[PDB]
Symmetry: C3
Subunit: 288 residues, 3 copies
């Protein structure tokens, strides 16, 4: 985990402990425009990234740069509003530092969210996709958050990712959606991480499509991965904010204004979802 | 753009201004063996990379390591003879530093050239290919020149690349070729950037082929990308210097001696082309 | 070769010379659990990585962290028990430093081994695969050991990899296997390097499969590549330690305990193989 040491994590976890009365169980990292979830907490105790000991700040635009503590629909969460991306300069051991601290803080579940582009045509903007799998492109080329000496206090050298996106939690998600009897089904498919801040070209989109991806994005994977390394339960969704183009002869392209998505009903649609889903995450009590 | 600051760009742009009387409009970055284009300028004022304030030098072999100023077939260009490649150690924010300076210098068009390998069988060495699209392999894994804090004085955080290789300029190129009624057509296809200085293996070539690439090379993309980020018009060609191999049972491989291509008629064929094409790049006057 | 200089290599080669009487011809780099080969040497003179001048140490767990010198089945080898991987923090110019020193030491052949995952279904664990080709994933994204200024004292700027895994030595391997009339054939196929220490997901495995890979692993390529750059003869095998998963609905995943493979007969099976194969590597005498 180059950069930080165990004790850096300990010292930050502890600092958090002795500065909040909350002992979170589920850590939620909100993607673009889905940070409204913070609103729904209770007994909320906000923490500015910067105020915490070794916490990677979030540049100057880190307006939504805070770690909120509270209770949501039954569980004592800890939310990350506004995360770190590879594309902004953060080496991956800064991007994923939270996940290690959430672990030592006591977390045992991580529900990671993000807005992503739509590659699967069956997807339509506004859609919500269940990450059943991911393709760690940067990781293939060495951009893996576990590069460097491994700490057997955190996990194994070679953790398997075959499993990562918890199966049961996916049943429960498919099901909770149906319970809400929602208009439009809870999409499910493979999520592909691509770093670059620029948006995919039509030649790029096509390789991802053949590659098996369904939604493309620029984060999540580093947090998914290091969480699993820790032994955290993991599941997540993607807010399809825009359909990804294809050559032939187009007329559109892709813009961030499409973030209107991340804020429109869609946003707060996933928020209700994520809220109700708190009721389907097992307690540490090993419930019986 | 880690490494340099806005003012580093300003200070270099200005230095260039107050050291040349030329206010270039089109910046041309010449690939291997196609640097003969410099010959054709007029009112040529050569500048040694090294003499310019923050300009990345080009090692010791930077013989063809200069930025020539002048007029070509009607426009006041600024040419880069001998560029920087990832494979020689340059972090991408040094490779692409010129494109930012050409921008502040006033440029509004960039015609980037390179020699590339032939993947599409329809290609035959000597051929010239029109880059209609590109696959930014390094970029997928984080090797994107826009990594780091974004400067809204240069462009947007998430620029789309869906478009990059200007459409009209491609009509004009296909057309100008036909105007010259040239022997052999102006190929067009997708260009794939691969970093490594070594040459592709037969297992590698095959993945690129299925991946959609037509020509493979080791540059251009970083300059294409940062140009678009700036709002520069962009179009380019590749000089197929050698056909890329495929398993089965071969007898050849790939060598740099194949640069004979980059210097043979082919070279100066693209040079006449690029020269005449100056007549088809719109003026800043918004011509009417 | 950023990091070290020619003289760093010279100073280490020489140090090795004036500290051993052995002038090795074949350098063997043993993969996981196949380091038992060291046992079979004779006139063995062990050297602790750390004791050698610029030699990258191997962390604290570098127990099997030594460079053994001796004679094996006829040739004066030099073996690397326990290599360096990208995933442990080593920049590739440290990972591959040995290959440069083995070169200056006089080596002219490198037989590299590794344990790898099975992607080709025809593969069955325990199997041994002949690396006929490789797909340098990290290399595509810039992770190539030849990045930086090139030393024409070592090799060419753009070395071709079209060839790398010596053809004749493969005939001899297929043949020697048949000579032993072994139970189970000497598999042959394409080896794909993936960096990350974590194990491939089912979405990842599928892209590698379509990509053409047969076995997947996390090393070898950097050593294969820099060897060829030097002009070393190269050939290698992979010990399929585990079959790689695929979605649908599985029940297994991948664990390091599967290293039981690397140590079981399989291990010492490749060891006899590699030993007998010493008899099929040409001598520097240009035998006649
Ligand atoms: O089509 C897409 N490709 C890649 N990343 C995407 C796409 N759509 C959304 N994002 C992610 C990456 C950054 C942020 C911008 O809103 O959202
Ligand atoms: O087949 C090829 N693959 C990759 N790069 C290539 C190929 N052909 C040319 N170049 C580019 C990369 C470096 C320079 C050497 O002349 O030209
Ligand atoms: O399925 C696999 N995928 C990637 N690397 C693998 C696989 N199997 C073995 N290794 C390599 C990488 C590290 C070491 C762990 O024993 O062996």
């Amino acid at each position: 985990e180059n950069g930080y040491t165990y004790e850096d994590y300990k010292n930050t976890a502890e600092w958090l402990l002795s500065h909040t009365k909350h002992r979170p169980q589920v850590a939620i990292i909100c993607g673009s425009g889905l940070g409204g979830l913070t609103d729904k907490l209770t007994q909320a105790q906000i923490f500015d990234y910067s105020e915490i000991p070794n916490f990677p700040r979030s540049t100057v635009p880190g307006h939504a740069g805070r770690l909120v503590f509270g209770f949501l629909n039954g569980r004592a969460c800890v939310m990350m509003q506004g995360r770190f991306h590879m594309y902004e300069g953060y080496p991956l051991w800064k991007v994923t530092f939270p996940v290690r601290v959430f672990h030592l803080l006591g977390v045992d579940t991580l529900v990671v969210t993000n807005a992503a582009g739509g590659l699967n045509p069956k997807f339509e903007v506004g859609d919500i996709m269940l990450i059943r799998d991911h393709i760690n492109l940067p990781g293939f080329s060495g951009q893996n958050p576990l590069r460097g000496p491994n700490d057997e206090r955190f996990g194994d050298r070679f953790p398997a990712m075959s499993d990562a996106y918890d199966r049961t939690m996916r049943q429960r998600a498919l099901s909770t959606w149906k319970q809400m009897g929602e208009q439009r089904e809870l999409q499910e498919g493979t999520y592909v991480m691509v770093a670059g801040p620029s948006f995919e070209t039509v030649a790029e989109c096509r390789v991802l499509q053949k590659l098996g991806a369904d939604a493309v994005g620029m984060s999540t994977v580093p947090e998914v991965i290091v969480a699993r390394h820790c032994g955290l339960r993991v599941f997540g969704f993607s807010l399809i904010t825009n359909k990804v183009i294809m050559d032939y002869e187009s007329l559109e392209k892709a813009n961030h204004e499409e973030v209107l998505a991340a804020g429109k009903q869609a946003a707060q649609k996933l928020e209700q979802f994520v809220s109700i889903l708190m009721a389907s995450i097992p307690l540490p009590d090993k419930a019986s």
